[PDB]
Amino acid sequence: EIQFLRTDDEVVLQCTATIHKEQQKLCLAAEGFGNRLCFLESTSNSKNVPPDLSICTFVLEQSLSVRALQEMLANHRTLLYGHAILLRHSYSGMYLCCLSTSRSSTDKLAFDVGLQEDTTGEACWWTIHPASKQRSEGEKVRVGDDLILVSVSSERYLHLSYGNGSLHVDAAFQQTLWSVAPISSGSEAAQGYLIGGDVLRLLHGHMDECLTVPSGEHGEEQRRTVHYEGGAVSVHARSLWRLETLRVAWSGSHIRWGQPFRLRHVTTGKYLSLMEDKNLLLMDKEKADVKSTAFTFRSSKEKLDVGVRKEVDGMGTSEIKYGDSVCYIQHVDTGLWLTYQSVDSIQRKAIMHHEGHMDDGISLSRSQHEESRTARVIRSTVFLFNRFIRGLDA
Amino acid sequence: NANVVVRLLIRRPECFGPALRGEGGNGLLAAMEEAIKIAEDPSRDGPSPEEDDTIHMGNAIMTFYSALIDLLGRCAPEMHLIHAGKGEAIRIRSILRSLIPLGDLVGVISIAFQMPTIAKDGNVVEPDMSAGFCPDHKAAMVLFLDRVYGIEVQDFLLHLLEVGFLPDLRAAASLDTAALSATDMALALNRYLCTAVLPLLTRCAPLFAGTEHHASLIDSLLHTVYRLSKGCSLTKAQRDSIEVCLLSICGQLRPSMMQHLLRRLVFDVPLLNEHAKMPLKLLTNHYERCWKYYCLPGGWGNFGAASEEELHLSRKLFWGIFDALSQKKYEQELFKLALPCLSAVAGALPPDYMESNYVSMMEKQSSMDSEGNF
């Protein structure tokens, strides 16, 4: 039984590009604050450079027919080909639209594609159309079908520009085949259980320690270490980690024991990793390899490995629960457990050990949407204002 | 049938031409300039191993682009649907506006023409029209301009008049000589103006409300239109169109900035020929409308006041018309149309008018002559 895309689901729009005779999969992305424009995020080199799907996820809010859309404009449904769909950017909460402005990349007959505050008007709405003759108008849209998006405001296809030096997405009269990948379904998500993409705090066995990094002393090299700390840092933003699965499709599904994932620091953008000298050190997006940045949750420290498992195309079963489950962090390749150094604002260093301690359990607390939003705002703003300061200094 | 054609053309953008497919396009104006250079270049215009003997590729490119622009402008939705707020009509107009920039439409109109020239022997050297830039090419530009973008703002109207519309009128007025009148280019230019430019300025007449410190441009336009109206090669329909256009413009124009045309009027009406019918009606309408500007010392501040020189000129007009009319033989239509004019001028002129004993010296012999008007 092939699944059908329906409203209130979370998806990412993917387009394939042939660059220097190399097939590369790209995802449409946008960052709410700072740049209303939309760009492209690569997801082909996931093994070496982890993609950022948090700014690529979109929510299908409304799916209306063309006639009904026109009527309301004058005044969990399943998507069928030919309906008008409203896409909401999951992070920003703003809607994809034809900006009616042109960046003029040698194509005068084109418009820019970005994000918009209001839902009113015909710019936010897009029409889905079959990619081949196998599909037809009114037919249900499968999860694996390719799609063509047409702007209601301008009848301009959601287009991928090969001609320009750096790949861009715009609204042009040439058509581009977009593939919709289901990220998560909120309806089939169990409340209180760990799902992929959550921003969470790693609480220690005493519930008053959280895995953090040193506070801001203007030293990014000192901010690269990882330690246990207690106090107000548990409600501060530097204790926030985003769990990122290694899969692109169904990344918002429930997290099971043994599932590899990457832990990203929200306020610094650096992924947790194990160095070759058995030391935890944050490293950059470009270097954040699967070999170093892969971690799993074990129900017990007992050595029986989870073994080979299949990834399932769905939300999956709910195994890890917030605040009622004891988890042990294990590096996938080395098998080392995460534990405190126990040497004597505790500043108890977090280290990797073959056996660890008996009180090495980690509790899970899910952060609030407000906290995650503010943390990503802080990261983006500090990056931009550091670029500004460097330019002024030059 | 217009929207569907718009769908089809936007789905296949290669129908728009190499200048406008969207990738590596030089633009409509650049294409028209490349075409007029190709038309001059003989290596590219002809095969180089009339129209069938030599298909001028420059003219072919220009007529293709003019036909595309004309088709798009005709595909533009009607004004009333836009006023009613029909979303699809608004969408079509926005698509066409995105397709064709305003500057490209302005530039093609700004492009000049090939001036017909008499020769040392007296024979007119005819530049071949089928091989060069044609008035119909600009006429299509005008149709797109007034059907898609719309001329609804005054400084835009004035800028367009200054850049592209006025020089064409001046060229038409310069080809008013008998030898140059029979030239095909003069006929084509006259048709283009009387079909596209004059009706446009007639429908956008209310925009001529405030043109105080563009006085020179509006005076030049009036003079050129009056000379073109005096032109002889014009047809009956062309005369009617230019009469309506001039009357509509002068009616909305403020009475202060039309004394310069009054001078020509007050000399040319007393001849009481067939050509005088339009100017004497124009005087009738002017003096019936702006009667308070003369009899009342002040009027509104916006009208201004009499300078006593236009007052002397109007009194001279009244007396000249009256005397020419008195020694003129009876013609029914001519007197029935002249009487309202004489009555209006008499009413506008103050009854107690101070006739200045100091009469004006050094009359404008150029505006005041027997032959050539220069």
SS (H, E, C) chain A: CCCECECCEEEEEEEEEEECCEEEEEEEEEECCCEEEEEEEECCCCCCCCCCHHHCCEEEEEEECHHHHHHHHHCCCECECCCEEEEEECCCCCEEEECCCCCCCCCCCCEEEEEECCCCCCCCEEEEEECCCCCCCCCECECCCEEEEEECCCCCEEEEECCCCCCEEEEECCCCCEEEEEEEEHHHCCCCECECCCEEEEECCCCCCEEECCCCCCCCCHHHCCEEECCHHHCCHHHCEEEEECCCCCCCCECCCCCCEEEEECCCCCECCECCCCCECCECCCCCCHHHHCEEEECCCCCCCCCCCCCCCCCCCCCCECCCCCEEEEECCCCCEEEECCCCCCCEEEEEECCCCCCCCEEEEECCHHHHHHHHHHHHHHHHHHHHHHHHHC
Residues 6+ apart with CB under 8 A from A186: A8, A9, A10
Residues of B in contact with A74 (CB under 8 A): 87
Q: Looking at the complex, does the CB of residue B95 fall below 8 Å from at least one CB of chain A?
A: yes
Measured between CB atoms, does B84 come within 8 Å of chain A? no
Interface test with A, best of B3, B6, B23 (most A CBs within 10 A): B23
Distance of CA A207 to the CA centre of its chain: 27
Chain B residues touching residue A99 (CB < 8 angstroms)? none
Work out the number of other CB atoms within 10 angstroms of the CB of residue A183.
23
Q: Enumerate helices (H) and strands (E) in chain B, giving the number of each.
A: 20, 2
Cβ separation of A107 and B23 shorter than 8 Å?
yes
Tokens 């203007």: give the residue: A218
The residue among A75, A159, A173, A174 with the most chain B CBs within 10 A of its CB, best to mutate, is A173
**Structure obtained using:** cryo-EM
By C-alpha distance, the chain B residue nearest A71 is B87
B13 vs A contacts (CB less than 8 Å): 109, 173-174
Q: What is the dihedral of CA A312, A316, A317, A322, to 10 degrees?
A: 120
Chain B residues whose CB is inside 8 A of the A174 CB are 13
Q: Which residues, in sequence order, are bridge partners of residue B300?
A: none
Q: How distant is the Cα of A174 from the closest Cα of chain B, in angstroms?
A: 7
Instruction: Kindly give the residue spans of alpha helices, DSSP state H, lying in B111-235.
Output: 135-144, 154-160, 166-174, 178-181, 184-192, 198-203, 215-230
Tokens for B272?
């009481």
Q: Which residues of B touch A109 (CB under 8 A)?
A: 13, 16, 20-22, 98-99
The minimal CB distance from B22 to the residues A109, A122, A153 is found for A109
CA of B252 vs chain A CAs: smallest distance (Å) = 38
B17 lies within 8 A of chain A by CB:
no
- Specify whether the backbone of A151 is left (phi greater than 0), alpha (psi in -120 to 50) or beta: beta
Distance between CA atoms of residues A55 and A28, nearest Å = 9
Q: How far is B135 from chain A (nearest CA, A)?
A: 27
* Data resolution in angstroms: 2.8
Instruction: Measure the CA–CA gap between A10 and A143, rounded to whole angstroms.
Output: 12
CA distance from start to end of chain A: 60
| φ/ψ of residue B153, rounded to 5 | -125, 140
Chain centroid to Cα A202, Å, comes to 19
B25 reaches A (C-beta below 8 A): yes
B20 to chain A: which residues are within 8 Å by CB? Answer: 108-109
* Nearest-by-CA chain B residue for A100: B98
Report DSSP letters for A49-112, one per residue.
S---GGGT-EEEEEEE-HHHHHHHHH--PBPBTT-EEEEEETTT--EEEE-S----SS-SS-EE
Distance from CA of A146 to the nearest CA of B (A): 19
CB pairs under 8 A between A and B: 42
Partner residue opposite B13 with nearest CB, options A106, A109, A111 = A109
Strand intervals (E) in A217-323: 227-229, 241-245, 261-265, 295-298
Query: How many angstroms away from the CA of B87 is the closest CA of chain A?
Result: 8
φ/ψ of residue B185, rounded to 5 = -65, -40
Q: Which of B13, B20, B87 sits opposite A73 (nearest CB)?
A: B87
**Chain-chain contact of A111 with B98 (C-beta, under 8 angstroms):** yes
B25 CB neighbours in chain A (<8 A) are 108
Of the CA atoms within 13 Å of residue B66, those in its CB half-sphere come to 19
Alpha carbon distance B239, B132 (integer Å): 27
Report CA-CA distances (Å) from A52 to A8, A158, A247, A262, A267: 21, 21, 12, 11, 14
Question: What residue type is assigned to position A148 of the chain?
Answer: I
Here the tokens at position A70 are 């026109």
Q: Do B91 and A163 touch (CB under 8 A)?
A: no
Interface test with B, best of A66, A103, A104, A109 (most B CBs within 10 A): A109
